Design a protein around this motif. Sequence first.
Motif, PDB file in Angstrom:
ATOM      1  N   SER A   1       0.830  -1.200   0.000  1.00  0.00           N
ATOM      2  CA  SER A   1       0.000   0.000   0.000  1.00  0.00           C
ATOM      3  C   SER A   1       0.870   1.257   0.000  1.00  0.00           C
ATOM      4  CB  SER A   1      -0.910  -0.012   1.231  1.00  0.00           C
ATOM      5  OG  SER A   1      -0.131  -0.029   2.408  1.00  0.00           O
ATOM      6  N   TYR A   2       0.228   2.427  -0.072  1.00  0.00           N
ATOM      7  CA  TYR A   2       0.924   3.707  -0.097  1.00  0.00           C
ATOM      8  C   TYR A   2       0.114   4.818   0.572  1.00  0.00           C
ATOM      9  CZ  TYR A   2      -2.399   4.459  -3.924  1.00  0.00           C
ATOM     10  OH  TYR A   2      -3.542   4.582  -4.666  1.00  0.00           O
ATOM     11  N   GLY A   3      -1.176   4.573   0.823  1.00  0.00           N
ATOM     12  CA  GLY A   3      -2.056   5.536   1.467  1.00  0.00           C
ATOM     13  C   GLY A   3      -3.500   5.373   1.006  1.00  0.00           C
TER      14      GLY A   3
ATOM     15  N   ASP B   1      -5.092  13.266  -4.438  1.00  0.00           N
ATOM     16  CA  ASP B   1      -4.212  12.110  -4.445  1.00  0.00           C
ATOM     17  C   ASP B   1      -2.926  12.403  -5.224  1.00  0.00           C
ATOM     18  OD1 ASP B   1      -3.872   9.195  -3.802  1.00  0.00           O
ATOM     19  OD2 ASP B   1      -3.780   9.088  -6.017  1.00  0.00           O
ATOM     20  N   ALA B   2      -2.856  13.570  -5.876  1.00  0.00           N
ATOM     21  CA  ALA B   2      -1.707  13.972  -6.665  1.00  0.00           C
ATOM     22  C   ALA B   2      -1.164  15.346  -6.253  1.00  0.00           C
ATOM     23  CB  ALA B   2      -2.120  13.959  -8.138  1.00  0.00           C
TER      24      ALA B   2
END
Length: 101
Positions: A2-4, A73-74
Motif C-alpha cells: 500500500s501507499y495511502g 491524491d496527486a
Amino acid sequence: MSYGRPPPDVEGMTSLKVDNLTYRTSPDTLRRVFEKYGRVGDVYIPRDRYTKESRGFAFVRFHDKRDAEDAMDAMDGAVLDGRELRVQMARYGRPPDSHHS
C-alpha cells in the motif's frame, strides 16, 4: 502492499479544500495546479485584510469530489513551492437551510 490509498467514505461530502502557502503562491497558480486534474469550482486565499501578508493557507474548493479525488491524491504533500502543499475535503456539499437536493 500500500501507499495511502484514495480517500475513505468522503461520499457524504463533495467540496475540496486546499491549504499551506508561501505568501506568493496565489490563487492563480493554485487554479492551474488543481483545475488541471479536472476543474476548480472555487479558488481563493483567506489571507489578512489590513496587511501585506497572509495566514499561510489557501482555500481551493472543488464542486465535484471526483476531480478532487485525483487532484488531492496527486497534490497532498506535493510540495509545490518547497513547503509541502496540503489537500483535503472541505466537508461541505450539503444543501442550504429550508431547502434540499
